[PDB]
């Protein structure tokens, strides 16, 4: 049987060009008013999944 993609992860990562993954930062979905504009500002643009977690994500998205 085909592997099934760990569906939850599919909805949080996108394979990039060189084979990276990029995600949305956490900590930006509520209880915001008390957080610096600088902090929140830096949390908008997507970011690459780190070297340490690559192992996990790939195992979640065999068909990425």
């Amino acid at each position: 049987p085909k592997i099934k993609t760990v569906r939850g992860a599919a909805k949080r990562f996108k394979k990039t060009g060189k084979g990276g993954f990029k995600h949305k930062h956490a900590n930006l979905r509520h209880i915001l008013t008390k957080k610096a504009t600088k902090r929140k500002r830096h949390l908008r643009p997507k970011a690459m999944v780190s070297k340490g977690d690559l192992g996990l994500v790939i195992a979640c998205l065999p068909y990425a």
Binding site: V6, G8, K11, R12, K24, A26, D53, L56, A59, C60
Partner: protein
């Protein structure tokens, strides 16, 4: 001569057997280590699981939204079109040259280099760099 053939050297790695004695290198324990969930028949833990800790693919927020229109738009390389067969690169036609796929309803032409034979492209979209390359090769781009 049917027993004088032999495979390319290092094309047939033997492959671990394990559980067969001290010498083998993979005896007794069979490279599984001592005890724990990871030994034991049917051991292991599921993907993404990282101890009871909240997993990466759950700490991080979802951000999807799937275009669905994108699913029916193809992209065309300059390298094609020469292979379209008939010097007219049309809404489909490419479709018939098996370079698009039936369901497609839209298509850009993209400077993916190399066009020679003059060609007229019709009903497609085409980038600034692609138009220029087509035209500079005697091509014509009518909407």
């Amino acid at each position: 001569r049917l027993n004088t053939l032999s495979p390319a050297e290092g094309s047939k790695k033997a492959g671990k057997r394990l559980g067969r004695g001290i010498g083998s290198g993979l005896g007794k324990t069979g490279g599984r280590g001592h005890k724990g969930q990871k030994s034991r028949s049917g051991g292991g833990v599921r993907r993404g699981f990282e101890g009871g800790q909240m997993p990466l693919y759950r700490r991080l927020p979802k951000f999807g939204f799937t275009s669905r229109k994108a699913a029916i738009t193809a992209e065309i390389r300059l390298s094609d079109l020469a292979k379209v067969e008939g010097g007219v690169v049309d809404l489909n036609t490419l479709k018939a040259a098996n370079i698009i796929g039936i369901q497609i309803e839209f298509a850009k032409v993209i400077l993916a280099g190399e066009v020679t034979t003059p060609v007229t492209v019709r009903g497609l979209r085409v980038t600034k760099g692609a138009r220029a390359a087509i035209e500079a090769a005697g091509g014509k781009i009518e909407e």
